[PDB]
Amino acid sequence: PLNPHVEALLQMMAQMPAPDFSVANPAEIRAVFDNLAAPPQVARVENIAISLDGRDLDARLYVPEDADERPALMVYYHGGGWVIGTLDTHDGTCRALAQKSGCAVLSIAYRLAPEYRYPAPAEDCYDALVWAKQNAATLGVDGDRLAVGGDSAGGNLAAAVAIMARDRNGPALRHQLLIYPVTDNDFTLASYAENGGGEYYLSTDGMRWFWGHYLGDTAAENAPLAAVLNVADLSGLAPATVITAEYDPLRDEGIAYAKKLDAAGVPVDAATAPGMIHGFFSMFEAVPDSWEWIERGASNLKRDLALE
Amino acid sequence: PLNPHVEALLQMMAQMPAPDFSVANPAEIRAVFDNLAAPPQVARVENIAISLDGRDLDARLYVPEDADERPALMVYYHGGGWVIGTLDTHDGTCRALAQKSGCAVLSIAYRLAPEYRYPAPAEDCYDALVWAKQNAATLGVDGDRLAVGGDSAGGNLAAAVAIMARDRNGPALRHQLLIYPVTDNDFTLASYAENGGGEYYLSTDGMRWFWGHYLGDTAAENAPLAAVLNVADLSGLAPATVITAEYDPLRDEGIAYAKKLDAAGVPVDAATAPGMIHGFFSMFEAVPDSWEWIERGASNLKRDLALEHHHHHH
């Protein structure tokens, strides 16, 4: 009989929005197959090696179709709980954001815990931002129209970099796109009870494991750029987008970070996506509804990164 | 409520590894997570342009992590019924084959029908192989360890290229990897009746459409490099792998071509994958069972493209 996984895939393909073409000519069929089979289309993808003091980081530059000659740049940090994830796991996510925002995206492969515990991953993310600013002309982008972004632990890193950039008089940032970010290590929140059992992909036990490897023996109170929620003064940070997911155990701490930013006078667009789980920005192929939220974040980037 | 598409994805996820957070084993959870819902990692990927007589083709070179300093090369032709498909639709498949074979892969964006009818796409694929051999040093590969492969109409084109290389004293080939290939336009074979209804991704009417665009006015009997099942003498062709799929309408013509290759004295690994549909090599993210077959084909490639002897005591 039919392979059960093949059956599930055919069923899933069946529940997807019909492509709506009137006739089967080559252009139509090409378009349908491209939509099914290829990652989101961009004009150019370049694998870049970033040579920093003491370490090289892999990076990937995405330039979308229809882009300016010198487009704005979002430096992007992948999720994976500071321990897993690669340029390849988040390639589709970066293509999608570049395509919808019209901005270039530079995805950074920062060093991972436990091999490189706190504060190494955040310093990598920050130094990559600085590198991008100082090598903007080489990249072909506008270094004066700069954003950071990331999902999950990557959103944690983006938030920390926004704070580092303020604190260190680093490169000016026009936006921080925080996609269901990790912001704290209080596992007693309602979100963790409701959503952290394992039934929505990310679990509370997962997050304990991630936090453990990231921090090692460093107590969370002595790792101020880890639990960014606990930072007292969030004033003067880049305008933010904070998108949380209804069925994410991280939902409550993400909402809380958005409230604390807005309280500190930072312009924030914050929303919890109904019906969604942790990771849904990367699930747009199986979950067409994800595109609405990718477009929302992208449209905020596009607005805040426009030429003055 | 929980998004219905999300719920379906979660059910799909509920049939695969459950992470063990009682074991601090980063390199394990890594190898698992990083390889689910993500194209396989390779060391180098480069977009290149191939300049042939009268046209330029886009191509993409994949060099896997543990390839030789001067790796063997498979020239790969994407499927799509000679009408559709791109380097991007088949990028995941090429990455998987490079990773599991240890060989470089050069994916070719040949010209498509009906704009370019038979035999132009096949000539593009053959001329790209000739180009790769001629420019092996430029690619950084071993021009004396060459293979071809492809899926569906791409496997068709790979088979045609193998025949053309033999006939024209073209580059020597060590293998042809034929993944559920098109080999004939006989829509009366049993697998069309069984599998071609449309419920298994590829339909009989779909194949009639593809064949129509590829041949145009040319009768199939005058297109032997399309209907390769009608080639009389298959002896002396590159050693082959022919993987077919149980629920593919192309199953029986693929089996038939494998049988003819074997009868002509060509070494052939041929098998029909139980439970699978047309296209399943590209479906490895949702169908992890695909990997068994991807590994088998890639392993046959590795065997026949094997490196020469080198002593290690220096």
Numbering used by the authors:
A (entry chain A): 2 to 309
B (entry chain B): 2 to 315
How do the authors describe this structure?
In sequence analysis, enzyme EstDL136 was found to be a member of the HSL family. EstDL136 exhibits two different activities for the catalytic metabolism of chloramphenicol (Cm), a widely used, broad-spectrum antibiotic; it acts as both a Cm acetate esterase (CAE) and a Cm hydrolase. EstDL136 cleaves the amide linkage at C2 of Cm and thereby confers Cm resistance to bacteria heterologously expressing the EstDL136 gene. Structural analyses in this study have validated that EstDL136 contains structural features characteristic of the HSL family, with an α/β hydrolase fold and a CAP domain.
